[PDB]
Amino acid sequence: RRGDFVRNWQLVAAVPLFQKLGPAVLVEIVRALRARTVPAGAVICRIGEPGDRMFFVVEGSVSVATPNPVELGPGAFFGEMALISGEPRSATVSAATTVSLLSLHSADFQMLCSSSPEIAEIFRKTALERR
Amino acid sequence: RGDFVRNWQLVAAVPLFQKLGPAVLVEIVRALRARTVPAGAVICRIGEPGDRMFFVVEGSVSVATPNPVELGPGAFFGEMALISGEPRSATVSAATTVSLLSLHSADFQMLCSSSPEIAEIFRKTALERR
Numbered sequence: 509r510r511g512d513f514v515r516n517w518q519l520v521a522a523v524p525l526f527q528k529l530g531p532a533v534l535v536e537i538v539r540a541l542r543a544r545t546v547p548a549g550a551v552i553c554r555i556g557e558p559g560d561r562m563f564f565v566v567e568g569s570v571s572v573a574t575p576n577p578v579e580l581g582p583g584a585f586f587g588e589m590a591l592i593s594g595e596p597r598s599a600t601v602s603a604a605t606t607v608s609l610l611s612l613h614s615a616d617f618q619m620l621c622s623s624s625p626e627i628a629e630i631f632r633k634t635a636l637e638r639r
Numbered sequence: 640r641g642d643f644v645r646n647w648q649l650v651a652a653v654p655l656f657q658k659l660g661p662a663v664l665v666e667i668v669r670a671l672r673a674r675t676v677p678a679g680a681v682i683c684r685i686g687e688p689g690d691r692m693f694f695v696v697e698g699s700v701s702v703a704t705p706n707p708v709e710l711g712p713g714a715f716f717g718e719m720a721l722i723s724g725e726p727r728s729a730t731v732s733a734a735t736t737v738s739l740l741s742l743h744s745a746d747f748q749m750l751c752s753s754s755p756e757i758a759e760i761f762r763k764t765a766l767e768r769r
């Protein structure tokens with residue numbers, strides 16, 4: 509899908525994390541990432557459910573329903589904890605505003621992790637801080 | 640007192656209210672009604688009159704639009720009837736057991752004129768939804 513591919517470049521530009529990727533790995537993730545828009549209030553992922561993908565916020569913000577809610581703005585990522593640990597979602601995440609998201613399925617996530625050990629590390633430490 | 644102190648811990652779960660200073664926060668904590676709705680139960684029904692709006696504290700709701708919309712903690716719904724004066728545009732049910740906070744019409748009017756920022760969020764989310 510070509511339309512999806514060329515649109516992904518401007519969306520990927522919104523996520524500073526990918527500034528750490530060379531051209532080849534950028535193409536891989538720009539191929540792998542799916543763009544979606546989530547209306548305000550809508551559940552993106554639900555506590556206790558299985559997680560097969562992780563998300564990057566392009567525009568808007570999400571709300572992690574931890575006892576003290578966590579707002580995540582553009583460039584932020586979530587959903588990595590279930591991918592790393594294999595456990596169900598630890599928290600519900602909803603669109604706080606209408607949200608533009610990029611999602612990464614599990615296989616592509618592991619491919620990004622081997623393709624970039626620096627980014628693997630960031631997901632790793634971030635998931636540790638969050639749990 | 641019991642309902643009042645319970646609302647403080649429930650209001651924490653709705654980030655929208657972080658836009659509110661202490662004096663308006665208080666009026667709203669005074670005004671909000673807490674309910675737990677069992678899974679599957681109708682919270683509001685399409686075509687019926689709406690005199691209140693809702694904030695999701697815990698659990699999620701399902702908006703019976705042609706393609707259903709699930710709203711999670713922190714989300715709000717029912718504002719469209721309060722703004723437009725029209726009947727509920729959709730049925731909303733508890734998707735799971737749901738902890739809600741509700742606001743009657745008058746206290747919604749109060750929240751809106753007391754927080755123009757929040758009135759605007761309600762306004763432009765309602766237009767998005769419509």
Ligand SMILES: Nc1nc2c(ncn2[C@@H]2O[C@@H]3COP(=O)(O)O[C@H]3[C@H]2O)c(=O)[nH]1
Pocket residue numbers: 553559572574578585586587588589590591596597598599600601638639
């Ligand atoms: N449990 C938890 N999750 C958080 C926090 N901040 C952000 N999140 C994200 O919310 C996500 C919910 O689903 P996951 O368990 O996949 O991964 C979680 C994290 O990526 C936090 O403080 N605690």
Ligand SMILES: Nc1nc2c(ncn2[C@@H]2O[C@@H]3COP(=O)(O)O[C@H]3[C@H]2O)c(=O)[nH]1
Pocket residue numbers: 683689702704708715716717718719720721726727728729730731768769
């Ligand atoms: N009509 C409509 N209502 C929605 C949508 N998403 C959430 N809702 C909520 O569902 C509610 C049903 O009652 P209201 O019409 O009072 O207000 C509505 C909104 O707050 C949507 O996409 N369309």
Ligand SMILES: [Cl-]
Pocket residue numbers: 547548549550764767768
């Ligand atoms: Cl919405």
Ligand SMILES: [Cl-]
Pocket residue numbers: 548549550604713714715716764
């Ligand atoms: Cl909302």
Ligand SMILES: [K+]
Pocket residue numbers: 521522523524566582583
């Ligand atoms: K950005």
Ligand SMILES: [K+]
Pocket residue numbers: 555572573574598599600601
């Ligand atoms: K949660």
Ligand SMILES: [K+]
Pocket residue numbers: 670671672741742743746
């Ligand atoms: K009220």
